[PDB]
UniProtKB/Swiss-Prot annotation, chain B:
Compartments reported by the entry: Lysosome membrane
Function: As a component of the GATOR2 complex, functions as an activator of the amino acid-sensing branch of the mTORC1 signaling pathway. The GATOR2 complex indirectly activates mTORC1 through the inhibition of the GATOR1 subcomplex. GATOR2 probably acts as an E3 ubiquitin-protein ligase toward GATOR1. In the presence of abundant amino acids, the GATOR2 complex mediates ubiquitination of the NPRL2 core component of the GATOR1 complex, leading to GATOR1 inactivation. In the absence of amino acids, GATOR2 is inhibited, activating the GATOR1 complex.
Taxonomic lineage from the root: Eukaryota, Metazoa, Chordata, Craniata, Vertebrata
Protein name: GATOR2 complex protein MIOS
Self-association and partners: Component of the GATOR2 subcomplex, composed of MIOS, SEC13, SEH1L, WDR24 and WDR59. The GATOR2 complex interacts with CASTOR1 and CASTOR2; the interaction is negatively regulated by arginine. CASTOR1 and CASTOR2 convey leucine availability via direct interaction with MIOS. The GATOR2 complex interacts with SESN1, SESN2 and SESN3; the interaction is negatively regulated by amino acids.
Family: Belongs to the WD repeat mio family.
Annotated signal sequence range: none
Length: 97, 94
């Protein structure tokens, strides 16, 4: 009950117990910040939603180029002990803008 | 030998029994073409040189670094998320 209030003061879920962040998402969609919506969706364990967000971001307002391929490179999640994509993602995270 | 006859004419290797396609690879980077140094390299089954071609070129020019992540992993499963995503994510590139 204490931790269910923090989410009502960080502006992620509106007043009420219907704790499922969907009204917040569409605002970020048609507000101009697609990447933030993708991250917020990811924190709720749904990567396909992130792919959907990033496709819309790439299609509109042109400017896809790298923001296109970033969806595909984020599509390849792995849970091994020696996953090559995992090692690369760990190494080169700081090279993005 | 009949297959190396075709390989010499194409330019993959040089006149000589050099099994490595390195001479092609290292002549291409100094020519400025980066993708042709990637397509050929991993056509010789080198996926840590695959990133290396895109990593080395990424210091100049710039999306290939993100593609380097995508071009790293692949699961070879029957319904893995990479395979379904990639077949569609290919056709949007130039």
């Amino acid at each position: 009950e204490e931790r269910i209030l923090a989410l009502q003061l960080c502006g992620w879920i509106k007043k009420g117990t219907d704790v499922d962040v969907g009204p917040f998402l569409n605002s970020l969609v048609q507000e101009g910040e697609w990447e933030r919506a993708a991250a917020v969706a990811l924190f709720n364990l749904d990567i396909r939603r992130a792919i959907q967000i990033l496709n819309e971001g790439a299609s509109s307002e042109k400017g896809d180029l790298n923001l296109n391929v970033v969806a595909m490179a984020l599509s390849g999640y792995t849970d091994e002990k020696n996953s090559l994509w995992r090692e690369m993602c760990s190494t080169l995270r700081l090279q993005l803008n």
